[PDB]
């Protein structure tokens, strides 16, 4: 049946608590069942969801939302539980504060009074700027104007939660194998969760917007990457509605000929994939190093910027991308900046344009840098060797003995993650020399890998020197969503990408990240002039690019060959947040036959023309909400 | 949002 959506998921969630988690694995299992104030339509506009109307004050500090009447919470079995009301959003944000949400960075400095409730300086949540004025009138008060505030409302920390239900479940609330431990107000009900097996939804047949829901069921099968041919195999059997293809699969020639008229390439996504550098490694349960001298050498090397730049310039991103995309389409996915270069624009200049204007202050090697997607602007063997020569002399003068050994962990179930890291290893070793740098690939189980990367509890658990196991996707429409998370104080995310969680660590001072904090904070204070705000965030990105503390490699999604039975451009389109069609399947339509590449390309050109129209119409309509 | 890169299914 076309109305039975089938695909895959890649990691069991640690929790169903969408208010507390910053991990996509929670979004994957909850977005289809939980709506907030807005969703995204198929052109990327904010669409009314639980908010039927909204207004903002002239000074931009007070947002008021009329809650749609008659929207119900339902159990996983379709039992009506309660009305959705403004109080559920008050409770949602209170729970996020009380239980110390991993995503608090995007609310703590925006909602008035929240930072003081978070720390305990204020004891009553009534002093926080979220108010149920009445059952269907929800009001937020902010510390400063935020043109991107409404875009935050498609992210999960701003979803509602019924307090009666939360309290009644107690310690059983939001348990990751128990769909009865949440309630659902969205287009689907979460019906099943089986570890390392399946995630299951059914259509919410009492949903207020069920007219825009065109799937009866959703089934996601667990996929750990050990059998990458299973995606196309299950598509062709009719089990899956979609299949991402891997041109390095041994049977790919047969698939390519079979589906010659159907394989098409998606646009690069907004999230960043690359390699984080652990600047403060604590644990060595996964290492090839055998002496303390080797461990000190690696620790000093990673604090040396020239050493990090040598790795950055040595990485052949086309070869890396080709381990999942094949040589022909590899360039499409390459990315040279943490922030997607066209994520925002200031007039005619992209964010990448602004970064490129400022980067050459750090060094002539950045002059003429091409930061655009779709080409490798950073790979340069000559510059990599030059930077390592500078690092070698500084490190030898400090008694460091070479080669520098770098532990990089891999999930031994994901064949093409191993292949990507093997390509990183060959890049660094061929350009800099194994006499100088050795990349020691640490193979481990899926669960062992999760517990030192994606689900690492703390910086001590980041048992690696360099890792590409975790990407970052933007949560709302402002460069802060990328750049704030690497500030010395954003300990939830600094452990994941940089290996530290102590904001005052000596390693953190040594690499100069307190300077990065000041650039980020100076950009954040610009609320008057968006062009100036973006120029200032580009100064922070410029510092980050030069620091090479994160090595960008490719877009974390998209830029891939795919097969589809989904009617092109019927799904939600979202650059940020938790309501895009990667996790949220309202609006999406399915069809009998496999989409042809010509059908997709024609729909895309027509969609691009309608999207520019619809987006401009939406922007012109914003003034009508200033009250 | 943090996402795992070991499998790139989209």
Author numbering:
A (entry chain A): 33 to 659
B (entry chain E): 1 to 10
List sentences from the manuscript:
Given the auxotrophic nature of pneumococci for certain amino acids, the Ami ABC transporter system, orchestrating oligopeptide uptake, becomes indispensable in host compartments lacking amino acids. The system comprises five exposed Oligopeptide Binding Proteins (OBPs) and four proteins building the ABC transporter channel. Crucially, SBPs determine the specificity of their respective transport systems, thereby governing the range of molecules capable of entering the cell. The five lipoproteins exhibit pairwise sequence identity of ~52–60% and share a very similar overall folding.
To mitigate uncertainties stemming from potential mixtures of different peptides in our crystallized structure, we conducted pre-incubation of the AmiA protein with an excess of synthetized peptide 5 before crystallization. This strategy facilitated the elucidation of the AmiA:peptide 5 complex at 1.76 Å resolution. Four independent monomers were found in the asymmetric unit, all with a highly similar structure (rmsd value ranging from 0.14 to 0.21 Å for 574 Cα atoms among the four monomers, using monomer B as a reference throughout the text). In this complex, the amine N-terminus of peptide 5 is stabilized in a manner analogous to the description provided above for the other complexes, involving pockets P1, P2 and P3 from the OBP. It forms a salt-bridge with an aspartic residue (D507) and engages in hydrophobic interactions with a neighboring tryptophan residue (W504). The initial four residues of the peptide (AKTI) establish antiparallel β-sheet-like interactions, engaging the terminal residues of the extended strand of β20 on one side and forming parallel β-sheet-like interactions with a loop of domain I (which includes residues S54 and N56, from pockets P2 and P3, respectively), on the opposite side. The oligopeptide adopts an extended conformation with minimal intramolecular interactions, displaying a kink of ~90° at residue 6, resulting in an “L” shape. The two isoleucine residues in peptide 5 (I4 and I6) tightly pack against each other, occupying the two hydrophobic pockets P4 (involving residues Y486 and V502) and P6 (formed by residues D443 [aliphatic chain], S446, Y449, F481 and L482), all situated in AmiA’s domain III. The lysine residue at position 2 (K2) of the oligopeptide is stabilized through a salt-bridge interaction with E524 and a H-bond with T528 (domain III, both residues located in P2) of AmiA. AmiA features an additional α helix in R1 (residues 523–530), a characteristic absent in AliB, AliC and AliD, which instead exhibit a four-residues-long 310 helix.
